Each structure stands twice: as structure tokens, then as C-alpha cells.
Design a protein around this ligand. Structure first.
Ligand code: HEM
Ligand code: HEM
Lengths: 145, 145
């Protein structure tokens, strides 16, 4: 279950998530847009899902993309803040899962975000250990999809 | 105009928003649920819009309501963090406006949140001065609906 996946996040994993977030989460606009644009660059097949945002190749200049990207980072902020209470983490994860289930995003497709996250982490010198920690957090959402 | 509304957020208004947020934003789960339940209690005619959350009278015990309420507080956190840059505040406000436009929520009904905000603030010893500051922020969202 989702609760199971959440309750598995160990102290070490939570430590790595918080340490890396202190950095990548410090510039939500810059890193949020980097995350989104990297997703579109490496997984062009996902562009169609974001038609509401207009021309995503416009990057930072696209106000709809910027608003979306900043907000995406607050969903992650939400997750990080709920790490010590699986019950709260689960209810917020399920909330965001619904947002994606309604758009027909499968657990497998949702996992496509791991590549971009790994790249954004690497830009700040956070290696594989950190990418693995984030993949575990993403897997909690996948358990709800 | 959302831009003219954003212009109403003067130095004094921004300070009052930040000062009060430091307190109410410290307990997102507790105050978020308080805000939502107050809205439902004082404006029963709005409960229909929240059909997805189930029995909202259950309050904190309702997992969907708790997830929704915590997330609502992160939307406010988002707004507060964008006060320095008008262009960024506008794009995030327009993003959330869409979430409500699709739910058929008008500017007038969105404004029904002012009562609950005033009550929650008052319980924390923040009077009319602060309630009015928050009404100006809510007015920016109203301009986009
Ligand atoms: C770290 C992972 C992710 C997080 C935290 C996340 C978060 C969000 C948030 C907060 C929204 C706005 C929800 C709303 O207001 O309706 C959203 C929308 C959306 N997401 Fe994600 N998302 C993630 C990954 C993905 C991936 C990998 C895909 C696609 C393969 C995806 C597809 C969508 C789509 C299509 C929308 C709707 C955009 C729109 O029309 O406004 N998301 N996401
Ligand atoms: C401070 C004011 C408010 C803020 C910041 C706010 C924020 C939010 C957020 C973040 C969501 C989730 C969007 C999504 O994922 O689709 C939401 C959903 C919603 N909001 Fe608000 N909201 C506010 C006031 C109101 C008011 C006053 C009403 C109604 C009179 C309203 C009606 C709704 C409805 C119907 C939903 C959909 C709930 C669901 O089915 O999940 N909101 N709001």
C-alpha cells in the first residue's frame, strides 16, 4: 500500500532527502523550470499532456509554465515537510495522485520524472545516493497510481 | 485586472501578511483544517462543490479533507513567497485561479473565504488590520476568476 511505501522511508533516506532539498528547494522558480524543461527535452512524448501550458519551449518566458513549475516545487515541499508522519504524507500523496489519475498518467509514466530529478540533483553535485533517495519518494506516489 | 490588484499590495500590506503568516503558517495541518471547516460551517451552500472529499463534517478524521487542507496552506505559502516579484505572484495566482474556474467558482464565492480567514486570524490574536491585509491578497485571485 501507499502507507507501506511511506513507512519504509528510513532515517538515512529522509536525511538525504532533506539535505538535498535544502539546496534544490531554495530556488523553486529556477530549479522548478529546469525540472520541467528537462522532462520535455528527454521525454518529448510527454509534451502533448501539457497543452494547457502553451509553447513549453519558451521556458522561463512562458508565464503558464513558470506558474506550473513553481507550484510543482511546493508539492515537493509539502512531501518533504510530511516525512516524519506517514499518515500525513499518505493523505497529501493521494491528493496529488488524483491530480494525475484524472490526466491518465500511469505509475510508469510518472516515473519518467526520475531522470530529470537525477540531472537537477547532479547540477548541484548531489550524486547517485541522492538520486536513489528521491526515487524512493517518487515510488510512494507510484504506489498510489 | 490582476495586475492592478497585485499593485495594491503595498509595503505595509506585505509586512502584515508576512508577520501573520509566520504564525498561522506554522501549523498548516491544524489551521488548514480550521479554515476549511469554518468555511463549510459558515457557508453551508458551498459544501456541494466539495463532493470529492466525502463527509466534510468529519473534519480532521477525514483523510481527503486533511490532504486537501494541508495542500491549501501550501498555496498560501506560495503566494507569500512570491510577494517580492509581482510577475511571479501573478503567474501562480492565475494557475490556482484555473483550478477554481474549472470548478465553476466565481469571484464572489471565492471571496467567502474572507470570513473564515478573519476568524482563524482572530483566534491567534490578529485583528481586523490583518484580516484586511489578507482580503487584499484574496482580491488578487478574485481578479483572475
Ligand atoms: C515529482 C513529480 C511530480 C509532481 C510533484 C507533480 C506535481 C504536479 C502538480 C502540483 C500539478 C498541478 C495539479 C493541478 O492543479 O491540477 C501537476 C499537473 C500535471 N502533471 Fe505533474 N507532477 C509530477 C510528475 C509528472 C509527470 C512525470 C507527468 C507526466 C508524465 C505529469 C503530468 C502532469 C500533467 C499532464 C499535469 C496537468 C498540467 C495542466 O494542464 O495544468 N506530472 N503535477
Ligand atoms: C484562500 C483561498 C483558497 C485557496 C488558496 C484555495 C486553494 C485550493 C487548492 C490548492 C486546491 C486544489 C486544486 C486542485 O488540485 O485541483 C483547491 C481546490 C478546490 N477549491 Fe479552493 N482555495 C481557496 C478558496 C476556495 C473557496 C472559497 C471555494 C469555494 C467557495 C473553493 C473551492 C474549491 C473546490 C471545489 C476545489 C476542488 C476540491 C476537490 O475536489 O479536490 N476554494 N483550492
Amino acid at each position: 500500500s501507499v502507507y507501506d511505501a511511506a513507512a519504509q522511508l528510513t532515517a538515512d533516506v529522509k536525511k538525504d532527502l532533506r539535505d538535498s532539498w535544502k539546496v534544490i528547494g531554495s530556488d523553486k522558480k529556477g530549479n522548478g523550470v529546469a525540472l520541467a524543461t528537462t522532462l520535455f527535452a528527454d521525454n518529448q512524448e510527454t509534451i502533448g499532456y501539457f497543452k494547457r501550458l502553451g509553447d513549453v519551449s519558451q521556458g522561463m518566458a512562458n508565464d503558464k509554465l513558470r506558474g506550473h513549475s513553481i507550484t510543482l516545487m511546493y508539492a515537493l515541499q509539502n512531501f518533504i515537510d510530511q516525512l516524519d508522519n506517514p499518515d500525513d504524507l499518505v493523505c497529501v500523496v493521494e491528493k496529488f495522485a488524483v491530480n494525475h489519475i484524472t490526466r491518465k498518467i500511469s505509475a510508469a509514466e510518472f516515473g519518467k520524472i526520475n531522470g530529470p530529478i537525477k540531472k537537477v540533483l547532479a547540477s548541484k553535485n548531489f550524486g547517485d545516493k541522492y538520486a536513489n533517495a528521491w526515487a524512493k519518494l517518487v515510488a510512494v506516489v507510484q504506489a498510489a497510481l
